[PDB]
């Protein structure tokens, strides 16, 4: 009819916005966790270098 189509369009705009936000948040999590794990690896290498210096 008439109002039904507009209501469907609203329900679809919510769909697109929610899905896009979810995908963006997932990409953010991937990037942040990669950052953290690379920092942890750098910390490990520093520990090993400290061990060599102690020797």
């Amino acid at each position: 009819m008439d109002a039904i189509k507009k209501k469907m369009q609203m329900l679809k705009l919510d769909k697109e916005n929610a899905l896009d936000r979810a995908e963006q948040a997932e990409a953010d999590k991937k990037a942040a966790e990669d950052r953290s794990k690379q920092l942890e690896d750098e910390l490990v290498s520093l520990q090993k270098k400290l061990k060599g210096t102690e020797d």
Binding site: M1, D2, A3, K5, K6, K7, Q9, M10, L13, N17
Partner: protein
Amino acid sequence: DFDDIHRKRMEKDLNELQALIEAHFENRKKEEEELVSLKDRIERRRAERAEQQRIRNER
């Protein structure tokens, strides 16, 4: 944000659209009521034509 104003805009769009939806609902509903009354007076016309035709045929 832009998402906020976009949301308010599609929101008022939904509001005006459902408003006009219920509006044409009511309009076509009145039209259907008028058409039903038309059918009713139509059946009245059928019955009156039937009885007067039958009287004519009796005579």
